[PDB]
Amino acid sequence: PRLKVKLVKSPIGYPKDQKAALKALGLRRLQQERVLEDTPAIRGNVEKVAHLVRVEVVE
Amino acid sequence: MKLSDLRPNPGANKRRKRVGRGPGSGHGKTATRGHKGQKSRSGGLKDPRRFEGGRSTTLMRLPKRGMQGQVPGEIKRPRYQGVNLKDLARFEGEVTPELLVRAGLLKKGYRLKILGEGEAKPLKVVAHAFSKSALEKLKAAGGEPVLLE
Amino acid sequence: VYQIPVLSPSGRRELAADLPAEINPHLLWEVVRWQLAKRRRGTASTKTRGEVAYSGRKIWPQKHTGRARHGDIGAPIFVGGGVVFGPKPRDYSYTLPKKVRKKGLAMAVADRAREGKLLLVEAFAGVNGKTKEFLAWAKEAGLDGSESVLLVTGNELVRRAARNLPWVVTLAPEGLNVYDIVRTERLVMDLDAWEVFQNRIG
Amino acid sequence: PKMKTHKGAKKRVKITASGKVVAMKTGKRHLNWQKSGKEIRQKGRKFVLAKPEAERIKLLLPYE
RNA sequence: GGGCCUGACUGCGAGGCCUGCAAGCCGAGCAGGGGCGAAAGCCGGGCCUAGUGAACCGGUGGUCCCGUGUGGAAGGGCCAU
RNA sequence: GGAUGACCCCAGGCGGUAGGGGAGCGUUCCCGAUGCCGAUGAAGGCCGACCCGCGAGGGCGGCUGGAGGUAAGGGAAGUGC
RNA sequence: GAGGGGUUGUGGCGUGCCUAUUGAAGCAUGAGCCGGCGACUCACGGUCGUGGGCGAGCUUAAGCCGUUGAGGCGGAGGCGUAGGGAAACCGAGUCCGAACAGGGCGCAGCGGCCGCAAAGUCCGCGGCCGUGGACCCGAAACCGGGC
RNA sequence: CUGUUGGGAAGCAGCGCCAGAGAGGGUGAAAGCCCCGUAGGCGAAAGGUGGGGGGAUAGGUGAGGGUACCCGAGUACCCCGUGGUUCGUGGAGCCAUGGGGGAAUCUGGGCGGACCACCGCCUAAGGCUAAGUACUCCGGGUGACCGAUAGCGCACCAGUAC
RNA sequence: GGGGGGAACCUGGGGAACUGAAACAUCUCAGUACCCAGAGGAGAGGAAAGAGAAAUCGACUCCCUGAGUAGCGGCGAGCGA
Ligand SMILES: NC(=[NH2+])NCCC[C@H](N)C(=O)O
Ligand SMILES: [Mg+2]
Ligand SMILES: [Mg+2]
Ligand SMILES: [Mg+2]
Ligand SMILES: [Mg+2]
Ligand SMILES: [Mg+2]
Ligand SMILES: [Mg+2]
Ligand SMILES: [Mg+2]
Ligand SMILES: [Mg+2]
Ligand SMILES: [Mg+2]
Ligand SMILES: [Mg+2]
Ligand SMILES: [Mg+2]
Ligand SMILES: [Mg+2]
Ligand SMILES: [Mg+2]
Ligand SMILES: [Mg+2]
Ligand SMILES: [Mg+2]
Ligand SMILES: [Mg+2]
Ligand SMILES: [Mg+2]
Ligand SMILES: [Mg+2]
Ligand SMILES: [Mg+2]
Ligand SMILES: [Mg+2]
Ligand SMILES: [Mg+2]
Ligand SMILES: [Mg+2]
Ligand SMILES: [Mg+2]
Ligand SMILES: [Mg+2]
Ligand SMILES: [Mg+2]
Ligand SMILES: [Mg+2]
Ligand SMILES: [Mg+2]
Ligand SMILES: [Mg+2]
Ligand SMILES: [Mg+2]
Ligand SMILES: [Mg+2]
Ligand SMILES: [Mg+2]
Ligand SMILES: [Mg+2]
Ligand SMILES: [Mg+2]
Ligand SMILES: [Mg+2]
Ligand SMILES: [Mg+2]
Ligand SMILES: [Mg+2]
Ligand SMILES: [Mg+2]
Ligand SMILES: [Mg+2]
Ligand SMILES: [Mg+2]
Ligand SMILES: [Mg+2]
Ligand SMILES: [Mg+2]
Ligand SMILES: [Mg+2]
Ligand SMILES: [Mg+2]
Ligand SMILES: [Mg+2]
Ligand SMILES: [Mg+2]
Ligand SMILES: [Mg+2]
Ligand SMILES: [Mg+2]
Ligand SMILES: [Mg+2]
Ligand SMILES: [Mg+2]
Ligand SMILES: [Mg+2]
Ligand SMILES: [Mg+2]
Ligand SMILES: [Mg+2]
Ligand SMILES: [Mg+2]
Ligand SMILES: [Mg+2]
Ligand SMILES: [Mg+2]
Ligand SMILES: [Mg+2]
Ligand SMILES: [Mg+2]
Ligand SMILES: [Mg+2]
Ligand SMILES: [Mg+2]
Ligand SMILES: [Mg+2]
Ligand SMILES: [Mg+2]
Ligand SMILES: [Mg+2]
Ligand SMILES: [Mg+2]
Ligand SMILES: [Mg+2]
Ligand SMILES: [Mg+2]
Ligand SMILES: [Mg+2]
Ligand SMILES: [Mg+2]
Ligand SMILES: [Mg+2]
Ligand SMILES: [Mg+2]
Ligand SMILES: [Mg+2]
Ligand SMILES: [Mg+2]
Ligand SMILES: [Mg+2]
Ligand SMILES: [Mg+2]
Ligand SMILES: [Mg+2]
Ligand SMILES: [Mg+2]
Ligand SMILES: [Mg+2]
Ligand SMILES: [Mg+2]
Ligand SMILES: [Mg+2]
Ligand SMILES: [Mg+2]
Ligand SMILES: [Mg+2]
Ligand SMILES: [Mg+2]
Ligand SMILES: [Mg+2]
Ligand SMILES: [Mg+2]
Ligand SMILES: [Mg+2]
Ligand SMILES: [Mg+2]
Ligand SMILES: [Mg+2]
Ligand SMILES: [Mg+2]
Ligand SMILES: [Mg+2]
Ligand SMILES: [Mg+2]
Ligand SMILES: [Mg+2]
Ligand SMILES: [Mg+2]
Ligand SMILES: [Mg+2]
Ligand SMILES: [Mg+2]
Ligand SMILES: [Mg+2]
Ligand SMILES: [Mg+2]
Ligand SMILES: [Mg+2]
Ligand SMILES: [Mg+2]
Ligand SMILES: [Mg+2]
Ligand SMILES: [Mg+2]
Ligand SMILES: [Mg+2]
Ligand SMILES: [Mg+2]
Ligand SMILES: [Mg+2]
Ligand SMILES: [Mg+2]
Ligand SMILES: [Mg+2]
Ligand SMILES: [Mg+2]
Ligand SMILES: [Mg+2]
Ligand SMILES: [Mg+2]
Ligand SMILES: [Mg+2]
Ligand SMILES: [Mg+2]
Ligand SMILES: [Mg+2]
Ligand SMILES: [Mg+2]
Ligand SMILES: [Mg+2]
Ligand SMILES: [Mg+2]
Ligand SMILES: [Mg+2]
Ligand SMILES: [Mg+2]
Ligand SMILES: [Mg+2]
Ligand SMILES: [Mg+2]
Ligand SMILES: [Mg+2]
Ligand SMILES: [Mg+2]
Ligand SMILES: [Mg+2]
Ligand SMILES: [Mg+2]
Ligand SMILES: [Mg+2]
Ligand SMILES: [Mg+2]
Ligand SMILES: [Mg+2]
Ligand SMILES: [Mg+2]
Ligand SMILES: [Mg+2]
Ligand SMILES: [Mg+2]
Ligand SMILES: [Mg+2]
Ligand SMILES: [Mg+2]
Ligand SMILES: [Mg+2]
Ligand SMILES: [Mg+2]
Ligand SMILES: [Mg+2]
Ligand SMILES: [Mg+2]
Ligand SMILES: [Mg+2]
Ligand SMILES: [Mg+2]
Ligand SMILES: [Mg+2]
Ligand SMILES: [Mg+2]
Ligand SMILES: [Mg+2]
Ligand SMILES: [Mg+2]
Ligand SMILES: [Mg+2]
Ligand SMILES: [Mg+2]
Ligand SMILES: [Mg+2]
Ligand SMILES: [Mg+2]
Ligand SMILES: [Mg+2]
Ligand SMILES: [Mg+2]
Ligand SMILES: [Mg+2]
Ligand SMILES: [Mg+2]
Ligand SMILES: [Mg+2]
Ligand SMILES: [Mg+2]
Ligand SMILES: [Mg+2]
Ligand SMILES: [Mg+2]
Ligand SMILES: [Mg+2]
Ligand SMILES: [Mg+2]
Ligand SMILES: [Mg+2]
Ligand SMILES: [Mg+2]
Ligand SMILES: [Mg+2]
Ligand SMILES: [Mg+2]
Ligand SMILES: [Mg+2]
Ligand SMILES: [Mg+2]
Ligand SMILES: [Mg+2]
Ligand SMILES: [Mg+2]
Ligand SMILES: [Mg+2]
Ligand SMILES: [Mg+2]
Ligand SMILES: [Mg+2]
Ligand SMILES: [Mg+2]
Ligand SMILES: [Mg+2]
Ligand SMILES: [Mg+2]
Ligand SMILES: [Mg+2]
Ligand SMILES: [Mg+2]
Ligand SMILES: [Mg+2]
Ligand SMILES: [Mg+2]
Ligand SMILES: [Mg+2]
Ligand SMILES: [Mg+2]
Ligand SMILES: [Mg+2]
Ligand SMILES: [Mg+2]
Ligand SMILES: [Mg+2]
Ligand SMILES: [Mg+2]
Ligand SMILES: [Mg+2]
Ligand SMILES: [Mg+2]
Ligand SMILES: [Mg+2]
Ligand SMILES: [Mg+2]
Ligand SMILES: [Mg+2]
Ligand SMILES: [Mg+2]
Ligand SMILES: [Mg+2]
Ligand SMILES: [Mg+2]
Ligand SMILES: [Mg+2]
Ligand SMILES: [Mg+2]
Ligand SMILES: [Mg+2]
Ligand SMILES: [Mg+2]
Ligand SMILES: [Mg+2]
Ligand SMILES: [Mg+2]
Ligand SMILES: [Mg+2]
Ligand SMILES: [Mg+2]
Ligand SMILES: [Mg+2]
Ligand SMILES: [Mg+2]
Ligand SMILES: [Mg+2]
Ligand SMILES: [Mg+2]
Ligand SMILES: [Mg+2]
Ligand SMILES: [Mg+2]
Ligand SMILES: [Mg+2]
Ligand SMILES: [Mg+2]
Ligand SMILES: [Mg+2]
Ligand SMILES: [Mg+2]
Ligand SMILES: [Mg+2]
Ligand SMILES: [Mg+2]
Ligand SMILES: [Mg+2]
Ligand SMILES: [Mg+2]
Ligand SMILES: [Mg+2]
Ligand SMILES: [Mg+2]
Ligand SMILES: [Mg+2]
Ligand SMILES: [Mg+2]
Ligand SMILES: [Mg+2]
Ligand SMILES: [Mg+2]
Ligand SMILES: [Mg+2]
Ligand SMILES: [Mg+2]
Ligand SMILES: [Mg+2]
Ligand SMILES: [Mg+2]
Ligand SMILES: [Mg+2]
Ligand SMILES: [Mg+2]
């Protein structure tokens, strides 16, 4: 199963490492969605910015 | 519910067609065979799938193609049966030849080759071969390809 | 889903067990058709014009007698000749699918559960092979011979006692089958046989 | 008894995935020196058989 | 009638004519490497319609696909004729 | 129309060989049947101007016959001259 | 016993039955008459159609155990799940090709996770085909061994 | 068991009884309890069988090191002519052999589809060997088998009369 | 000790033709029908100079399957491990 992640909340005012997790995810702009594999390495970063991101599991 | 209620559903048990049994039936006299030829006879015609009245036959005027083989016959060589990633969706943990012959996907005596139709899953998949596209998908999805010998 | 009565010393209990609620009559017809056809002997036979005892001699010349042309007297146009397409020894059996038999077995019992005709018993009190003994038990158990009963128990001593009654058909549970279930008006089983029955529909 | 595969058909013909019957075009076994390249090239390809004849051949191959 | 030439192409082939099948026929256009022309273009034989023969079996040139435990070889397959 | 083939109303079709389809009748046998019909008369036979069915047929009654027959609903064929 | 049965004088109309044929009452075939016997079946495989079971799966063969008109076990194997190529081989593609060109043959459920349906497959039934003598009867002949 | 109708009860009726027996066939008609049976049980002095149980007997039995003695002959092997196998001369091997030539004893020989090499498999030219398998003159059991033109050619004095 | 008999069954030694190929010769029918010798309640076969690719199996006989596969074939009809 894959992952469709949406950037819903702004990272402004959040620590530099959460800022980076979006760079690894590839999320750059608000409401932008990227479709990514459900790998535990990708999963650890999504669960990092989970409070700023909207995840739906399209398989 | 006792016996005398047991019935086949409508249409489940049709009567037979009996020929040569009178004018009123529709099938009397000539038994639906018409009149008086080789087809009308007990014994009938030459094989309708092939024979054509003496002329060279539609099948026999076509040319042969390709290796037909010789004695002592088939050459023993390894045989590959492919199964798609879509088929692996039902499994967890490990995937092997013997497991895919049990679920009824891979056939015995056949070496396992994975092909790329569908999505890959984070499974350890042990096969004799992989398609290039199944290889990429498997890596990129958290899966572990494991060749054999 | 069904509430199946149990006879006992300590209470006409109520055991539950999931039998199908949909009964498919045609499927039950298909099981009985199989049951009855696979028991056929297929010993009907006739003789062909090559199996008949006469010789292969032309009885009289083809032409110039004023009679019809004939070959040998074994031909099926003669009285005493062979018979055309007569019955030959046959096997009428065939492999009805297991899931059709198995589900037909659940359906047959479910049909008697709908009616209150299925009755289970813990044991049989004083019956030890004597018909008079089974008869007394049946009466206190509410089987007075007005309804035909399929008794299904592994107790040999209980099957011997009942088997000669005109209204009773005895079976060991391994022999439970839809024809005998549908043949009768009521179903009476051990708990040991009921357990066996559950182990055959799963 | 069980039907036998016609080997003459087996050696000339194939049943495709949707049930069509393909064979080699005829007419280039020999006498090709005065045949145009268009004639040789196109006679090098497979063709789908007309439906009546295909349905006859398929019956001869009951285990493909 | 003359000049230069070899398209009397290789790899394909949209769409059709004809038609019981199998055949037969016409074909723009794209690619390879060319010929003629300043060029627009033309050229996949010949003004056109006859000048022909399905398959099986075998020959020859190529290809290097198969090679009966393995490497070869025998013998096949494929392309051409 | 009414909900279903419950029946009714309206309109149209309904010559037929080869031949395609459909719906039925009857014969032998099995399940139903440890039943049921039967000496107050089984099957079969001979009548009938009677009833039901388009028809194949099925009843009913009289006579003969003297011991068998077998429903509703299904099953299988040595099934109709 | 306002109806019905039997009979048939007169009047009207009126070319047997079957087979074969372009066409028969036909002066074309068959049949004296009556009764009984008498011709489209079965096995295995195939192919459609159909009634059910299960469904990315479906199904067991021999046999084993039970029964004594009881059913069960048994997964060996078979069909299906992937095609294209003479093949090596590759694979949702592949083959021809120099081609990433063109072309052949291939690839993709209805509903509010459960229902409904469905590839497929198993069994029953039915039509037709193949193999058998294959709807029934009929030669003249051929061969074998004897008389 | 009794009564009743009837030529006859086993039919109908009253009241009973058995059942490890309600398979079936009889008895003047239609009988669980009348007869023969059926369920369940028992039975061989004599002959046959005895594949199972027991007991005899025949036969069965190491390790190194050395020696290179033996290991199935008109055989193997090759060639010619055939057969067998799925193999019809095919690239034609394998197993068999009518003709000709013709070895060796393990460092011997045959095979793995011409052939060669490599790698393996196997031990020819002496013999025997239960069980599982086939058939049905004979006996019994059982039929959605026939019912006297049917079923065997024969239900009967039939392989007869002719 | 042999001889001769025995319904089929079995082994061995010999061995057709109609037919099918819509003619026919190779091919088929078929090592079938039949003749002959022998066997016994069975007969044959049987303890690898096997199989053939599993770096494997492990006498023979018989059923199922593998499989109408592999192949054979005027590469026709068909035959068929
Ligand atoms: N245990 C049994 N097999 N019971 C079934 C009845 C057996 C026998 N057919 C009888 O009627 O008595
Ligand atoms: Mg903020
Ligand atoms: Mg940090
Ligand atoms: Mg039927
Ligand atoms: Mg009918
Ligand atoms: Mg039929
Ligand atoms: Mg019909
Ligand atoms: Mg007829
Ligand atoms: Mg009629
Ligand atoms: Mg019709
Ligand atoms: Mg008609
Ligand atoms: Mg007629
Ligand atoms: Mg017809
Ligand atoms: Mg028809
Ligand atoms: Mg017809
Ligand atoms: Mg006719
Ligand atoms: Mg005509
Ligand atoms: Mg005609
Ligand atoms: Mg006629
Ligand atoms: Mg005609
Ligand atoms: Mg005709
Ligand atoms: Mg006719
Ligand atoms: Mg005729
Ligand atoms: Mg005939
Ligand atoms: Mg004919
Ligand atoms: Mg092949
Ligand atoms: Mg071989
Ligand atoms: Mg029968
Ligand atoms: Mg029969
Ligand atoms: Mg007969
Ligand atoms: Mg007979
Ligand atoms: Mg005869
Ligand atoms: Mg005869
Ligand atoms: Mg005779
Ligand atoms: Mg005879
Ligand atoms: Mg005689
Ligand atoms: Mg004769
Ligand atoms: Mg004759
Ligand atoms: Mg004779
Ligand atoms: Mg004769
Ligand atoms: Mg004459
Ligand atoms: Mg005369
Ligand atoms: Mg006469
Ligand atoms: Mg006559
Ligand atoms: Mg005559
Ligand atoms: Mg005759
Ligand atoms: Mg005769
Ligand atoms: Mg007879
Ligand atoms: Mg007779
Ligand atoms: Mg007859
Ligand atoms: Mg016949
Ligand atoms: Mg006949
Ligand atoms: Mg028959
Ligand atoms: Mg039989
Ligand atoms: Mg059938
Ligand atoms: Mg069967
Ligand atoms: Mg009873
Ligand atoms: Mg009863
Ligand atoms: Mg019973
Ligand atoms: Mg009984
Ligand atoms: Mg061929
Ligand atoms: Mg050609
Ligand atoms: Mg040619
Ligand atoms: Mg060529
Ligand atoms: Mg050539
Ligand atoms: Mg030219
Ligand atoms: Mg050209
Ligand atoms: Mg050219
Ligand atoms: Mg080319
Ligand atoms: Mg197959
Ligand atoms: Mg396939
Ligand atoms: Mg010029
Ligand atoms: Mg130049
Ligand atoms: Mg076109
Ligand atoms: Mg055309
Ligand atoms: Mg160009
Ligand atoms: Mg250019
Ligand atoms: Mg140019
Ligand atoms: Mg230039
Ligand atoms: Mg230019
Ligand atoms: Mg052009
Ligand atoms: Mg010209
Ligand atoms: Mg010119
Ligand atoms: Mg031409
Ligand atoms: Mg030929
Ligand atoms: Mg050739
Ligand atoms: Mg190579
Ligand atoms: Mg190589
Ligand atoms: Mg090799
Ligand atoms: Mg080398
Ligand atoms: Mg070399
Ligand atoms: Mg060649
Ligand atoms: Mg070569
Ligand atoms: Mg070559
Ligand atoms: Mg190539
Ligand atoms: Mg060519
Ligand atoms: Mg009209
Ligand atoms: Mg009409
Ligand atoms: Mg209709
Ligand atoms: Mg009827
Ligand atoms: Mg009738
Ligand atoms: Mg009967
Ligand atoms: Mg009865
Ligand atoms: Mg009765
Ligand atoms: Mg009465
Ligand atoms: Mg009386
Ligand atoms: Mg009377
Ligand atoms: Mg009768
Ligand atoms: Mg009447
Ligand atoms: Mg009287
Ligand atoms: Mg009467
Ligand atoms: Mg009687
Ligand atoms: Mg009657
Ligand atoms: Mg009846
Ligand atoms: Mg009925
Ligand atoms: Mg029934
Ligand atoms: Mg008949
Ligand atoms: Mg009058
Ligand atoms: Mg008038
Ligand atoms: Mg008149
Ligand atoms: Mg008129
Ligand atoms: Mg007249
Ligand atoms: Mg007239
Ligand atoms: Mg008439
Ligand atoms: Mg005529
Ligand atoms: Mg005429
Ligand atoms: Mg006249
Ligand atoms: Mg006249
Ligand atoms: Mg006249
Ligand atoms: Mg005349
Ligand atoms: Mg006349
Ligand atoms: Mg005539
Ligand atoms: Mg006639
Ligand atoms: Mg006469
Ligand atoms: Mg008369
Ligand atoms: Mg008559
Ligand atoms: Mg038919
Ligand atoms: Mg059949
Ligand atoms: Mg069918
Ligand atoms: Mg079907
Ligand atoms: Mg099922
Ligand atoms: Mg299953
Ligand atoms: Mg292929
Ligand atoms: Mg393509
Ligand atoms: Mg395409
Ligand atoms: Mg469904
Ligand atoms: Mg289905
Ligand atoms: Mg058909
Ligand atoms: Mg035959
Ligand atoms: Mg026939
Ligand atoms: Mg037929
Ligand atoms: Mg003569
Ligand atoms: Mg001859
Ligand atoms: Mg001759
Ligand atoms: Mg002659
Ligand atoms: Mg002679
Ligand atoms: Mg009296
Ligand atoms: Mg009395
Ligand atoms: Mg009994
Ligand atoms: Mg009785
Ligand atoms: Mg009796
Ligand atoms: Mg009675
Ligand atoms: Mg009775
Ligand atoms: Mg009695
Ligand atoms: Mg006993
Ligand atoms: Mg006894
Ligand atoms: Mg030593
Ligand atoms: Mg030595
Ligand atoms: Mg030796
Ligand atoms: Mg010697
Ligand atoms: Mg030789
Ligand atoms: Mg040879
Ligand atoms: Mg040979
Ligand atoms: Mg060859
Ligand atoms: Mg050979
Ligand atoms: Mg020799
Ligand atoms: Mg050695
Ligand atoms: Mg050596
Ligand atoms: Mg040797
Ligand atoms: Mg050798
Ligand atoms: Mg070898
Ligand atoms: Mg060798
Ligand atoms: Mg080799
Ligand atoms: Mg070996
Ligand atoms: Mg023993
Ligand atoms: Mg023995
Ligand atoms: Mg034995
Ligand atoms: Mg007997
Ligand atoms: Mg009788
Ligand atoms: Mg008589
Ligand atoms: Mg007789
Ligand atoms: Mg009589
Ligand atoms: Mg007799
Ligand atoms: Mg007779
Ligand atoms: Mg006499
Ligand atoms: Mg002697
Ligand atoms: Mg003797
Ligand atoms: Mg003797
Ligand atoms: Mg022999
Ligand atoms: Mg001898
Ligand atoms: Mg011989
Ligand atoms: Mg001779
Ligand atoms: Mg011949
Ligand atoms: Mg034929
Ligand atoms: Mg034949
Ligand atoms: Mg012929
Ligand atoms: Mg012919
Ligand atoms: Mg001739
Ligand atoms: Mg011939
Ligand atoms: Mg032969
Ligand atoms: Mg042969
Ligand atoms: Mg012989
Ligand atoms: Mg014989
Ligand atoms: Mg003897
Ligand atoms: Mg024995
Ligand atoms: Mg022996
Ligand atoms: Mg021996
Ligand atoms: Mg030995
Ligand atoms: Mg297979
Ligand atoms: Mg198969």
CSV table of C-alpha atoms (C1' of nucleotides) in Angstrom, one decimal, chain G residues 144-147, chain I residues 4-6 9-15 32-39:
chain,number,residue,atom,x,y,z
G,144,G,C1',-8.5,-67.4,-42.1
G,145,G,C1',-9.1,-72.4,-40.4
G,146,G,C1',-11.6,-76.8,-41.5
G,147,C,C1',-15.3,-80.3,-44.5
I,4,G,C1',-5.2,-87.0,-23.1
I,5,G,C1',-9.1,-83.4,-21.5
I,6,G,C1',-10.7,-78.5,-19.5
I,9,C,C1',-8.1,-66.4,-18.6
I,10,C,C1',-2.1,-66.9,-19.8
I,11,U,C1',2.7,-67.5,-22.4
I,12,G,C1',5.4,-68.7,-26.4
I,13,G,C1',5.8,-70.2,-32.1
I,14,G,C1',3.5,-68.8,-36.7
I,15,G,C1',-0.1,-65.0,-38.6
I,32,U,C1',-6.2,-58.4,-34.1
I,33,A,C1',-9.1,-63.1,-36.2
I,34,C,C1',-7.3,-67.8,-36.6
I,35,C,C1',-3.8,-72.2,-36.4
I,36,C,C1',-0.2,-74.6,-33.3
I,37,A,C1',2.8,-75.9,-28.7
I,38,G,C1',2.9,-75.3,-23.5
I,39,A,C1',1.3,-73.7,-18.6
